[PDB]
Design a protein around this nucleic acid. Structure first.
Lengths: 460, 460
DNA sequence: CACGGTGGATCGAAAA
DNA sequence: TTTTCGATCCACCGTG
DNA sequence: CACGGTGGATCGAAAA
DNA sequence: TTTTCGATCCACCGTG
């Protein structure tokens, strides 16, 4: 007999982001004005939380890192998504399977020059849909939202590709290491897709291309593995590297100095223009600073194409063809094919000195027919907004919410609040934003795309 | 017909420190669970706030600074303290006067090395009691609390003594510039005391002593003007400066180098010990870093007296006699007098080389009889906890609450939330602390003081 | 180094 | 017996 | 520069 | 007529 359910009061704690102290104070002030039934006491919130945890048999918590058993975590999640909204026993007869996207990335812990918090990265899983015979019973209303990035693991390690392959291999041991979920008198098998990637990890792990050659030219998407964004921007800035002589080679001692000084002044002017972070940053002598900035190369098409002096029209065409696929809309096979033909005419004509990179040519002659029979899927990688807000809350949880003790339970409580944000039982009432904020992109997309869609994604 | 009064809902916004967004979200979630009458909508909170403001005829708001008319502010405050708890028309007949303490100080805006927010300082007023014939009708339950530091002015200027005297003079023009308050069919005159001082401003403004001489030795409290703390610690560290030769003079080129290096190593070891901020800090070649640290010289009596190697017993005696006055307890005239005699015996004996400073000797021969007929009052300067939490909220209000616009209304909103924290109508439910936290100080106080007190101040 | 802030462990009592 | 619930207490961490 | 966050101005409608 | 109330919109400011 309480107004707020404890199961709703936990989501109330979520939306407000309160302390324990804040919550007890608010309840008690509601009390002292004669009204009792509104706020449940904190103890029932505690019980709701312990319910939302998986049992501590599977928690691996350290000062440095933490993880969970994928099996038990999936079972917990399907138990919840049972209980919350599935109209119970709408069907029992046909055998059920649960579909999920998964993956991970990280970021550096930017801080003052007087700080051990260096970087973080988080193994992650998101349930997308629950399938039965009559239909997929369950769907996520806002899949790309961070509301369902159930954490699987995280660690306090810099994003060095070695430990990246180590966690890669580990999770690849665990993919088959599941037994189907058994709960609620029901068996439900599982199925995963590894797509929740930042945009550099397939260049880390599938580097076997290395711009070597093009197989058809003489399957591998590139659009579904980092979206091939970084390669195109990297090769066009390599052109911007070679924008003085407009020649393939500069090797022998003829251009190195003025090349270096020209890129220095490009890096300067870009620091003036967009707060583009330093590109001579170490990174092992290779510049890849930001993939979101890589995208921001293409929302200023005319602007940065003037800054680089390349034909704004051509890179505008390519920005169009790039933003035309990941949106996942129906693309006309022959029209986009022959537009790739015309843009290739101009690409190969107006630039002869340098060579085409891997994924560009893979698109040029080869990409269209690949789009014909492709398994193109809007990659389940959480939105850039999602990942950014995730880092935001992570910083804050560690800073304004975490326990201050021997600090192992610190990261425990972090995982706790994360999985609470994950448990689909709580309908997490996110901070308000404009309803759609989905800017229908350039007219060159508007006519090169088709508006007959069983989707309308804002970002994914 | 709402559970929370808007006048209480504003204090509810205070205790929780919420956004507008947070408040509307919490109310609406209370709505969607069938219960309406609990939370008043934000509009009535708006009205409560505009009521709590003084009319904008008197607001002086800038990008840089802001102030109010003392007259109108006092009238607003007495109007509130009328309405809130005065049992109305308990008396009308006898003419009423209102007593208030006032003053100001500031602090630097400590920030990263990548920041215009440099320092702040705030003219301030606090109403203590309202007087009538039968009794002082109104008292403050927790006077030294920051709950009633009604802001009068503040500015974005470094604490340079020039503008300090300028604001000093300004407020001294305004003291007499009041007409008695007229509201509620009642006249009530006013009366102020300038005591809300940091601890350096009377050394700024009443520097006419300059350790020159002692008048009685051949009125001016020193205990009621900065409590004479900084002078005693400064002269004893000057002794610590001269703790190698233990002689008055070192002037000619004989000691300057090793003096400098010795104070360097003292500053080093103190940086290791307490996080004592740098003392060679510019300040115009004069070291006065922190008055709270000046106090913290005396809560480690044996510790820092060992670090300086001075007799821990003597400075322990002086710490006792200092903490024995501002607590305001009844002090036995002859016993404390003759204890000042004995501590003077040992002070003047064990140290002959240097000379006594002003306020020390003023205490020694002279201070006791001055305590006899003194106007000793526990100085109305807000607690160090109060001022610290004030800087804390100021930083946060500017950072997590302020409007982000042309930023004049920024400091407007700052003043707004401050005066809301001030309006005595709202019984501000502060963050919880231990009930008393009043450590009954050293036994040398316990017997040199008397326990027959119509006061028991935790800090003031 | 002392002093505010921290979700969850424990007390312990009362309840229940 | 369980179950609530307020009190505390942690051990660390900023700015002092 | 683009993108989340901000108390108070205005709309505007409905109410009232 | 007034009075509420949700929507928006500000123009700036961090980390990107």
């Amino acid at each position: 007999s309480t107004i707020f359910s404890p199961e709703k009061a936990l989501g109330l704690l979520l939306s407000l982001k309160l302390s324990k102290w804040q919550y007890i104070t608010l309840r008690e002030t509601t009390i002292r004005e004669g009204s009792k039934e509104i706020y449940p006491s904190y103890y029932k919130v505690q019980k709701a939380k312990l319910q939302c945890y998986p049992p501590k048999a599977f928690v691996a918590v350290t000062d440095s890192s933490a993880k969970i058993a994928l099996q038990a975590l999936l079972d917990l999640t399907v138990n919840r998504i049972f209980e919350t909204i599935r109209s119970p026993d709408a069907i029992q007869n046909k055998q059920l399977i649960l579909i999920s996207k998964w993956g991970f990335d990280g970021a550096s812990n930017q801080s003052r020059y007087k700080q051990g918090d260096s970087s973080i990265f988080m193994t992650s899983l998101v349930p997308l849909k629950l399938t039965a015979d009559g239909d997929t019973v369950w769907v996520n209303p806002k899949p790309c939202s961070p509301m369902y990035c159930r954490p699987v693991q995280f660690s306090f390690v810099k994003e060095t590709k070695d430990v990246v392959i180590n966690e890669k291999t580990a999770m690849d041991d665990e993919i088959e290491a599941l037994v189907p979920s058994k709960c609620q008198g029901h068996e439900i098998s599982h199925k995963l897709m590894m797509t929740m990637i930042d945009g550099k990890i397939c260049t880390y792990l599938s580097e076997a291309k290395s711009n070597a050659a093009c197989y058809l030219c003489l399957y591998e998407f590139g659009l579904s593995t980092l979206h091939a964004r970084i390669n195109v921007m990297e090769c066009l800035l390599h052109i911007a590297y070679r924008l003085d002589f407009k020649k393939w080679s500069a090797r022998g001692e003829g251009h190195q100095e003025l090349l270096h000084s020209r890129k220095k002044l490009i890096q300067d002017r870009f620091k003036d223009d967009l707060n583009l972070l330093i590109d001579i940053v170490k990174q092992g002598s290779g510049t890849t600073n930001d993939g979101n900035t890589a995208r921001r190369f293409f929302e200023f098409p005319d602007k940065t194409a003037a800054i680089t002096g390349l034909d704004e029209d051509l890179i505008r065409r390519f920005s169009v063809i790039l933003q035309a696929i990941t949106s996942g809309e129906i693309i006309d096979v022959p029209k986009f094919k022959e537009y790739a033909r015309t843009t290739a005419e101009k690409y190969v004509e107006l630039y002869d000195w340098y060579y085409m990179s891997s994924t560009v040519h893979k698109l040029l002659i080869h990409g269209g027919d690949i789009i014909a029979e492709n398994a193109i899927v809007p990659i389940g990688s959480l939105s850039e907004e999602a990942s950014e807000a995730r880092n935001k809350d992570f910083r804050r949880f560690r800073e304004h919410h975490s326990r201050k003790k021997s600090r192992q339970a610190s990261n425990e409580d972090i995982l706790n609040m994360l999985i609470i944000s994950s448990d689909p039982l709580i309908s997490f009432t996110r901070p308000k934003l404009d309803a759609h904020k989905r800017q229908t992109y350039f007219k060159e997309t508007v006519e090169l795309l088709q508006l007959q869609d069983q989707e309308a994604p804002t970002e994914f």
